[PDB]
């Protein structure tokens, strides 16, 4: 039973500096994976500067002031990951955890109507006791009576206030996804062709808005809308478009010279 | 203690494996139950996860199923007749899985008179007996030992694991297999 993380064995997307202490806050089991989450001490202290250390950081959390998906989370080690909605009523800001196109976690600011729904991907389907078919989700939810057209690769729109699955997005050819793993993580694209290969990993071929073709495993894609215009959720400021490394290097030198 | 590892087994080359750890608790085994006939005495065993595994010592009764009729009846074990592992386990009358036993046969006859109405007259209103009994027929080797008093049967549960002596009645070629080996 591990209870510690070393700050070197912590994920790189958290961006904790190696010289500040040996340890990182090991996220508890919960909704999201340990490799694939951002625990609430890092959001309150390192992302947002509401807390200067971990001692000011539990003055916020243990008091019941941060809400992940409409419910107050008093754990600094609670795993918040992809598509979660983090509200704070006192400062009046609410955010969504999305991946930006460089693969890192990004806090997308939200309205009040956009902060009620979240988008969740089915990971398993089974029948529970009774004859109730429940749907297992990447965020750990077990929706008991989902839309009967739910398959495993699909996306359920959820509305975390009134816990009612308001919508369904099937996983087909004509849909748009966001990639949540691999080298292509954070990129958004239309689906082109899904190569099955039964017994092994499904490969999904994807085309971007510019036309850049790229592939991933189909367990890494997360469908978020009917097309790239009609996305069901708002995405970070690049909107899944990965610029060239040369062109994005030129633009920062131009912006820094034009600023002085 | 007792271990279930391959650390003591020789390699397929015949080489000895040199051991560089202590025994783990996660690789243990325990002493066998050796369940016999007798009045019921069980001892639970604390397994992994805190689950309980009920050792059966001295069992005398179980739920035996008659699979063509899809029913079961709690009957009493009479004798241990044939065991495929050793004839020495028959003599000490050990209950294991798949050993051949004789059971009581009285609830099976009484059920066969209550259902299908055949003895080995009182509800004249309900002859749903006639709605059955026409298509169905009963194997002769069953009906002989059913009225002889004891029926040969096969244990289908693991008693040292579950503390039960459940079973099934021998039918078909399986009964005719074991009747030749006895007599």
């Amino acid at each position: 039973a591990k209870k510690h993380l070393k700050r070197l064995y912590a994920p790189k997307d958290w961006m904790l500096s190696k010289l500040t202490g040996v340890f990182a806050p090991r996220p508890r089991p919960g909704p999201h994976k340990l490799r694939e989450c951002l625990p609430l001490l890092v959001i309150i202290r390192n992302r947002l500067k509401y807390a200067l250390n971990a001692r000011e950081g539990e003055m916020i959390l243990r008091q019941g002031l941060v809400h992940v998906d409409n419910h107050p989370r008093r754990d600094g080690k609670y795993p918040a990951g992809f598509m979660d909605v983090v509200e704070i009523p006192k400062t009046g800001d609410r955010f969504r955890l999305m991946y930006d196109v460089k693969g890192r976690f990004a806090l997308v600011s939200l309205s009040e109507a956009e902060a009620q729904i979240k988008l969740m991907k089915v990971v398993n389907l089974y029948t529970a006791t009774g004859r109730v078919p429940v749907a297992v989700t990447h965020d750990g939810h077990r929706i008991r009576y989902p839309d009967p057209h739910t398959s495993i690769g699909d996306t359920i729109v959820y509305n975390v206030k009134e816990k009612k699955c308001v919508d369904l997005i099937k996983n087909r050819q004509g849909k748009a996804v966001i990639v949540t793993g691999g080298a292509n993580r954070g990129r958004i694209g239309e689906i082109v062709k899904v190569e099955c290969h039964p017994g092994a990993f499904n490969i999904a071929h994807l085309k971007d808005a510019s036309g850049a073709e790229f592939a991933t495993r189909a367990a890494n894609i997360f469908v978020i809308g009917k097309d790239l215009n009609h996305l069901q959720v708002t995405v970070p400021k690049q909107q899944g478009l990965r610029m060239n490394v040369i062109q994005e290097r030129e633009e920062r030198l131009i912006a820094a010279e034009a600023r002085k | 203690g007792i271990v279930r590892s391959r650390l003591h087994k020789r390699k397929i080359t015949g080489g000895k494996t040199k051991i560089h750890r202590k025994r783990m608790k996660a690789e243990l085994g325990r002493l066998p139950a050796n369940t016999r006939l007798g009045a019921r005495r069980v001892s639970p065993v604390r397994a992994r996860g805190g689950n309980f595994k009920i050792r059966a010592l001295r069992l005398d009764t179980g739920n035996f199923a008659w699979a063509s009729e899809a029913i079961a009846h709690r009957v009493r074990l009479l004798d241990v007749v044939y065991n495929a592992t050793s004839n020495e386990l028959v003599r000490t009358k050990t209950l294991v899985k798949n050993c051949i036993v004789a059971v009581d046969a009285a609830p099976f006859k009484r059920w066969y008179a209550k259902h299908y109405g055949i003895d080995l007259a009182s509800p004249k209103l309900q002859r749903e007996w006639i709605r059955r009994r026409r298509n169905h027929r009963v194997e002769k080797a069953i009906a002989d030992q059913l009225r002889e008093g004891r029926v040969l049967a096969r244990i289908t549960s693991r008693p040292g694991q579950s503390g039960r002596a459940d079973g099934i009645l021998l039918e078909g070629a399986e009964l005719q297999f074991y009747l030749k080996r006895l007599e």
Binding site: - | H136, E139, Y178
Partner: protein, 156 residues
């Protein structure tokens, strides 16, 4: 009319001091459904394993009773699917396959013949001779050395 006339003992398969039966299905049903009964006569359990492997003519219409078999048991084929050539068939219902490969040495820019031998459980659906090329699928441990189980035999 009351008597049923059940099936007689098939002594060709019954050799083994306990009755050889399949645990999946009961042989003794009177009005057995069309679920598991095969073409000619008897009740049989046959299973379709995954990856586009066609079950043989035997294991559906055969008479043999095999446990540890991928088509007629609870043995599931999963993980690795490999190929080898049959080396020896001297064991009972088990073959040893030989996997011959070239090992490249980065220093001396040259390959090197190596081999791995695997004990593979062979169903009575199959009779492979030495030199036959087989396709094996990984299963659970079935003995001290058996992890694989033959799925298809390619003759000669």
């Amino acid at each position: 009319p009351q008597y049923y006339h059940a099936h007689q003992v098939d002594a060709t398969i019954q050799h083994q001091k306990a009755y050889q039966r399949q645990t999946a299905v009961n042989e003794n049903m009177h009005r057995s459904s069309r679920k598991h009964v095969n073409k000619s006569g008897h009740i049989r359990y046959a299973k379709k394993i995954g990856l586009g492997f066609k079950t043989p003519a035997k294991a559906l219409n055969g008479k043999y009773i095999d446990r540890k078999c991928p088509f007629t048991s609870n043995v599931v084929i999963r993980g690795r699917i490999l190929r080898g050539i049959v080396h020896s068939t001297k064991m009972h219902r088990t073959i040893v396959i030989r996997r011959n490969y070239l090992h490249f040495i980065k220093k001396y820019q040259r390959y090197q013949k190596r081999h791995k031998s695997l004990a593979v459980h062979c169903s009575p659906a199959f009779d492979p001779k030495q030199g036959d090329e087989v396709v094996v699928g990984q299963c659970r441990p079935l003995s001290k050395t058996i992890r694989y189980n033959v799925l298809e035999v390619v003759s000669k």
